[PDB]
Amino acid sequence: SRDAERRAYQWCREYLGGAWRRVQPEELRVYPVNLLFRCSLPDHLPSVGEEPREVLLRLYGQGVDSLVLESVMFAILAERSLGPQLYGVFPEGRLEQYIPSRPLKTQELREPVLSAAIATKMAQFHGMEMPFTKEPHWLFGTMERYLKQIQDLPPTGLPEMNLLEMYSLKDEMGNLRKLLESTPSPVVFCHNDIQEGNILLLSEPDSLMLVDFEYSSYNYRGFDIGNHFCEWVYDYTHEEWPFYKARPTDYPTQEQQLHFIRHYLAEAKKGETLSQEEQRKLEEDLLVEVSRYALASHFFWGLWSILQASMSTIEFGYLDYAQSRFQFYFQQKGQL
Amino acid sequence: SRDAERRAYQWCREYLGGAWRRVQPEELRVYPVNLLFRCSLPDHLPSVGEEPREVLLRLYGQGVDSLVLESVMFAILAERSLGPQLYGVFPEGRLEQYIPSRPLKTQELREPVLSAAIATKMAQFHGMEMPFTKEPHWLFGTMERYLKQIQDLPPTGLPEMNLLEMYSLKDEMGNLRKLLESTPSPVVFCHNDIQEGNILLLSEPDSLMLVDFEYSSYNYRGFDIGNHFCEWVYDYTHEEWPFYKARPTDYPTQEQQLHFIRHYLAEAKKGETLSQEEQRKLEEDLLVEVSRYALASHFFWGLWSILQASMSTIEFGYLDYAQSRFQFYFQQKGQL
Numbered sequence A, B: 001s002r003d004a005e006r007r008a009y010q011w012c013r014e015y016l017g018g019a020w021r022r023v024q025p026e027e028l029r030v031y032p033v034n035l036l037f038r039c040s041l042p043d044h045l046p047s048v049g050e051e052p053r054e055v056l057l058r059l060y061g062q063g064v065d066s067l068v069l070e071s072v073m074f075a076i077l078a079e080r081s082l083g084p085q086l087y088g089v090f091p092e093g094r095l096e097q098y099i100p101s102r103p104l105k106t107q108e109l110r111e112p113v114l115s116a117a118i119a120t121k122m123a124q125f126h127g128m129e130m131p132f133t134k135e136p137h138w139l140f141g142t143m144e145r146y147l148k149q150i151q152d153l154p155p156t157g158l159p160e161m162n163l164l165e166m167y168s169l170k171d172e173m174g175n176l177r178k179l180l181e182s183t184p185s186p187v188v189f190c191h192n193d194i195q196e197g198n199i200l201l202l203s204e205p206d207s208l209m210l211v212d213f214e215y216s217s218y219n220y221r222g223f224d225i226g227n228h229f230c231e232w233v234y235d236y237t238h239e240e241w242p243f244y245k246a247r248p249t250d251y252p253t254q255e256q257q258l259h260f261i262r263h264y265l266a267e268a269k270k271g272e273t274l275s276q277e278e279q280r281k282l283e284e285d286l287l288v289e290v291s292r293y294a295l296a297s298h299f300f301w302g303l304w305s306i307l308q309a310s311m312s313t314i315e316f317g318y319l320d321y322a323q324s325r326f327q328f329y330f331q332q333k334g335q336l
């Protein structure tokens, strides 16, 4: 649309500057990749200074405090080379670095060399000191909030038993909390959504970059790792309803888990002098830690998915997905 | 107050973490330095990780968008070692690094070695790419806004001629705009308030750090330099009403101006191959540039001061100060 093009043009000229000042409106069109759009400097123009030639316009399409935290977080991760560079912030959105790349696919997560690189990157992320609350209320605080939001949803006319009741989730949350309370896991700065779609394979390699910090917070290490392992099971590119596919046998084997964990710990502990024996203990303990915190991935996203279903119709089977996550929760809990 | 102490304690524990978790309430008291407070970790406690032992709590005591920009800016300057580190952001304020230091005094600005260091630091600041509007509307946009705000002030009962009328400021703004429009000055990321009080002399030296980014924006280089030169004249520590003192003969001489400019340009142009002749031209041009943009410092702060006067009584002579700035404006304009 004319208006959308004009706004993008203005934002690029104003926030990027440099060569962008020389761009004529007729030479720039936005490309959707929807709230996300690519903008590229015309080939004929040389860059002036360090201003980027390739950006993504992200439109917000959220509380004040929330927006402050989100923007500060993005800005800091950019400075630390853990996210895309930040070129403009304005009321409607932001301008970010377009990272030349493609996202990983579900099946690629299991490849040993990529898996090692993901583990290293996650550990790097977990090394960050960020100016946010360090108290680990995010996990159960968010789940408790989601549960309350679900309880408060207006009835829709759908006749099925409420998933909260079918799976006894209010009670089960207490059961999960008790299990996890018995399971030490250090509190670190977590991504919280390290799925394939958020892992960019760089065309100009440090071979990967994480994106999508919507859910990031100080949280239990075990959640970030366990959540990533859960993602090995789900492909969100499936072309028929419900528009995801679960392959439970694709959950990582013990050997695949340990491979990841060894590389994670190599990065996390790189500044430390540890014996082979101490290292093995750290690995074994982390295996157990993750086996329990992985359950929280199912619980968390199942609750989140019920809420998504309340805002959805036929574009994705959110309720179906929720039920998949809760089924796997009880299966894997039973397998501990 | 009990409540203030409790909040500070909670914020420190929650946002700083580490050793702060071990602090008992009875061991921590805030020290005013008022919206700014020092918090120090008890001596007996060892640090756990990289969490700071010495912080400043800054209470806000402002629009959403404004707060986003302010916080992003602070966070970025911290990452780039151009401002204090940022340890917490929350609705009420922030936690910052306490920089072991003291502020400069007015008279110290003229010392050649310090002046050279200030010039270098200002040029460093001007090297920053920041995710904010690059269009230079800040100067006249802000002054136009201030003028409109002054026009809209409720009458108070004070009988004196309005300074806008006494100094024909609406007309004069157009005169200034025309002069500056004829005066090239590159648009860079400016501090906009490089007064002595905002220049910290480090106790653990890079010998200085700037603080107070309230006014920072993309703006004309000439304003930042000229404003700094104006500050050589004013001491805001004067102990009798109006609680500032002006010493007009303390404005930098041509030689003092050129000393500063040489050091500024040495930093600004460090990546460039310039002949002695080209360098001298850059210096001479900058001298003229600054001589004109310095006038905008008087105008800007005079307008700002009228607004401050509307919220003040006996704590500082804002209207008196405004009149000082406007008098010097017309004097220095006449001397061009």
Ligand SMILES: C[N+](C)(CCOP(=O)(O)O)CC(=O)c1ccc(-c2ccc([C@@]3(O)C[N+](C)(C)CCO3)cc2)cc1
Binding pocket: A193, A195, A212, A214, A236, A237, A243, A301, A305, A315, A316, A321
């Ligand atoms: C577990 N997970 C990490 C939760 C957080 O998701 P995000 O990372 O915020 O996406 C992923 C997840 O639950 C998820 C991921 C993707 C999708 C999704 C994928 C595709 C579509 C779709 O493009 C499918 N469609 C093309 C057939 C119609 C338009 O909508 C809609 C939704 C739905 C759910």
Ligand SMILES: C[N+](C)(CCOP(=O)(O)O)CC(=O)c1ccc(-c2ccc([C@@]3(O)C[N+](C)(C)CCO3)cc2)cc1
Binding pocket: B193, B195, B212, B214, B236, B237, B243, B301, B305, B315, B316, B321
């Ligand atoms: C030109 N300037 C850079 C404008 C921006 O000021 P800020 O950097 O935001 O302070 C500085 C300026 O105009 C200014 C700077 C300081 C003061 C000021 C200094 C001291 C006080 C004072 O502490 C004086 N008092 C102790 C006698 C009573 C309480 O208020 C009040 C105001 C007033 C004005």
Ligand SMILES: Nc1ncnc2c1ncn2[C@@H]1O[C@H](COP(=O)(O)OP(=O)(O)O)[C@@H](O)[C@H]1O
Binding pocket: A033, A036, A056, A084, A096, A097, A098, A099, A100, A101, A102, A103, A197, A198, A200, A211, A212, A213, A214
């Ligand atoms: N900075 C970037 N450069 C290139 N591609 C990106 C960038 N950020 C996100 N993407 C891609 O765009 C898609 C959505 O971006 P993301 O930040 O994950 O938003 P969301 O998942 O909430 O829509 C992802 O597939 C991701 O691979």
Ligand SMILES: Nc1ncnc2c1ncn2[C@@H]1O[C@H](COP(=O)(O)OP(=O)(O)O)[C@@H](O)[C@H]1O
Binding pocket: B033, B036, B056, B084, B096, B097, B098, B099, B100, B101, B102, B103, B197, B198, B200, B211, B212, B213, B214
């Ligand atoms: N991070 C810091 N560490 C130590 N002192 C500081 C720090 N920030 C500000 N100060 C000092 O506190 C005073 C006020 O801080 P500043 O940021 O300039 O706020 P404002 O001038 O708006 O009150 C200044 O005198 C400055 O020297």
Ligand SMILES: [Mg+2]
Binding pocket: A197, A198, A211, A212
């Ligand atoms: Mg994403």
Ligand SMILES: [Mg+2]
Binding pocket: B197, B198, B211, B212
């Ligand atoms: Mg200050």
